[PDB]
Amino acid sequence: MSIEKIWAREILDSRGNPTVEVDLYTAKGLFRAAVPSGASTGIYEALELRDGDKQRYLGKGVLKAVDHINSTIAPALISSGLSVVEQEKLDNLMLELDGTENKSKFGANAILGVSLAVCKAGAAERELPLYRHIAQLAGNSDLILPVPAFNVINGGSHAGNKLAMQEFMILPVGAESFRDAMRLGAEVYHTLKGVIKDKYGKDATNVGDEGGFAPNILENSEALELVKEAIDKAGYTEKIVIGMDVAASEFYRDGKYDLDFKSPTDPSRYITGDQLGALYQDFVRDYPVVSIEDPFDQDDWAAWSKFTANVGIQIVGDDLTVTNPKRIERAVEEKACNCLLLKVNQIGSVTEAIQACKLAQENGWGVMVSHRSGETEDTFIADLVVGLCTGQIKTGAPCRSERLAKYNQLMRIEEELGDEARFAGHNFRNPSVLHH
Amino acid sequence: SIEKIWAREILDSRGNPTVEVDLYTAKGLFRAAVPSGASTGIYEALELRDGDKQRYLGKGVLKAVDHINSTIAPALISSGLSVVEQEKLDNLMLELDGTENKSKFGANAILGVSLAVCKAGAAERELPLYRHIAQLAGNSDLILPVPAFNVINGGSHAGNKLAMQEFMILPVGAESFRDAMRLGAEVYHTLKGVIKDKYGKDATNVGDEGGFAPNILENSEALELVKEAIDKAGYTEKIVIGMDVAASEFYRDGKYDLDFKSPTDPSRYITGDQLGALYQDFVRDYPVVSIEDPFDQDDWAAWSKFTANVGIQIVGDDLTVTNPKRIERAVEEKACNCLLLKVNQIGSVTEAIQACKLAQENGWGVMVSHRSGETEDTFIADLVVGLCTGQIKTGAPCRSERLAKYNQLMRIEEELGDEARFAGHNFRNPSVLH
Ligand SMILES: [Mg+2]
Ligand SMILES: [Mg+2]
């Protein structure tokens, strides 16, 4: 009566690893989605189910997840006779069939793939663009194009350099529109590539998983100066600001923090959380840093709360919250942060990710929709960030098409929305104040 | 027939603007995007760029988009020709431009419409795109290509000392295309590990095509690295090596400089004969089965001499630039035995199909090719199957502007079912399987 067919297969993601793609068929046609993947397993993440056969793709095959869709999830959904518009009921049906709290039986990658395909097929049955269907599933009316946060400089475990902080990003908060923000981002990206080529050599301009550069930078402040200089030389000093992903859990060491964790271990150099907090206040004074992700360890709750109570910038939970609602509730209760990173495959279904998002927003938080380091040609999260009206998305450098595919789709959405398109701009934290 | 044609500016995989085209018929919306091209080639179809330094550092494509929206779109809608009539639609755009290299509207403007028309035509004929392409080309067979995976980079766009531009791997002995992706990915990841140990984490960042560029000086060192990864991955029997030398990049004073990236001195330059001698040692000592642009784009006597003296595939890229008059000359003088087919170098579906059939009539192989700047578009995946050329090079199995083509080939193979055939060891002449 609704779903004609559901067929899953194994494709390759942007790192050359297998992942789940799902085809769903209705009288309106073929609706296809693919699943992203992080670099490592997180303890609070919903389970990404992998084959573990070390011969085939080093044990990263997803044949087990694909067979669960084709042999179990697909018949159950078709036989339920539920319409594809009933996102919550079909999601609930899969959560019940799985019957585990972390989706360890089918894998969040199996369950998500169907959830995304159902959402796409539901939008066509409603005769709505995907982003408007999502807005209705979430209870929004006034769509917003987000500020993109473009990865440009990498450190931490992403790089062989001494730089201990993981990612430095640029946000074109001063752009006139989302299409204008893509232009400002690309021009600074290329300006910065030129600067790196001259200062560090041609070798220093190859790219990492998310399309950013990882030159041999030694000091965290030298990276910030590099980014500031590319923005200034591109001519956009006041229109482009900086975001950072510290990923502080990476250099967390016995209750302290090792800002040189890639040099031979020396405990005497570890600094306390309060010492790390003071270093951030110096960055925020000397550089236009408006957002910091994971400034402290994912269990260092006391440091988060003290920093968030004492600075006025955006403080993003990533490893702290893990798109996990029980963790979010504790983070809200302790005022640990004021923005949620939203990674849909960390929670495993469209419904639960919309609920995670409404949990944060109803408590005054920003929400930044996020990519994974292993992405696909899928663009679902571009429609998601518009429908959820969060005003901010980080989905890579303006380089590599698993990133540009999202940005290109957002420009198409802006074009479709026309005179009713509102760009979040300097209100990326609170886009609700914009619409009239 | 065509309800609407609407072009917009999008960003390609390097972050530069390119042309995307929406085409509406009564069957729905058909979307296609154009890869990065050259705007100043001498034989190439030329892409139109804006050159407005206030926008994308002069790289905008607003002019091309305007040519589509203001001129090509009403003309083609006015024609009343159905979307199936690929060749009549393509000739109309060719006549409207009225230049051989498409420098009025831009090769990027003409191709984007051409691709969108083709996708609309498939649906109108109730055929998947690759079957529609087979019919436009006169083919009744369908063959999955052997993929050529870029893995190591040198030449002009790598900061190392390696003169030669790209080393690829071809899983000729895989059981199918799906198996061929597994083999290529597993060797690619093995290589990443070898490179991280030998050279360091930083040396595993990727170039435009997803391949690596560690700091190696001699080309033999690069070939050993590929062989070592193939070996450790366990596929010495199943994977061979392709090369793209891009020798035009180091052609100096009628001679060849294999250290052109280091401070100059003509004393170290070597003749075409000496370069050909080194290729023969390469072919003797490593499983190299294909070499692209071994000599300069106009050193015709070096091409003809080398091709007469080896058994391997010799691919023209800068030699032929997908240009029929350049191709005829290469045929005449036996310069090479394989055409690298870059569809945006020619400018339309119909012309690219003609160029491919021209090479194939003369016993040449045809290698369908990506560009440095690609998009999420997957057209060339359906193209290489529809033309049955048996080989495609569209990147390392890394970066999704590359994997999108490869993933689409896996989908096509699953659709073909028991009819799906993998070119395998006949990647040069897939027609022996017909
Ligand atoms: Mg993070
Ligand atoms: Mg070439």
Swiss-Prot record, chain B:
Its EC number is 4.2.1.11. The modification N6-acetyllysine is found at residues 4, 59, 63, 88, 192, 196, 198, 201, 227, 232, 255, 334, 342, 405. GO terms for biological process: canonical glycolysis; gluconeogenesis; glycolytic process; response to estradiol; response to xenobiotic stimulus. Mg(2+) 2 binds at residues 244, 292, 317. The keyword Lyase applies. It is found in: Cytoplasm; Cell membrane. The lineage of its organism: Eukaryota, Metazoa, Chordata, Craniata, Vertebrata. Mg(2+) binds at residues 244, 292, 317. It holds the Pfam family Enolase_C. The alpha/alpha homodimer is expressed in embryo and in most adult tissues. The alpha/beta heterodimer and the beta/beta homodimer are found in striated muscle, and the alpha/gamma heterodimer and the gamma/gamma homodimer in neurons. This is Gamma-enolase. It comes from Homo sapiens. Mg(2+) 1 binds at residue 39. InterPro entries: Enolase, Enolase-like_C_sf, Enolase-like_N, Enolase_C, Enolase_CS, Enolase_N. The modification Phosphothreonine is found at residue 25. There is a cross-link at residue 201 (Glycyl lysine isopeptide (Lys-Gly) (interchain with G-Cter in SUMO2)).
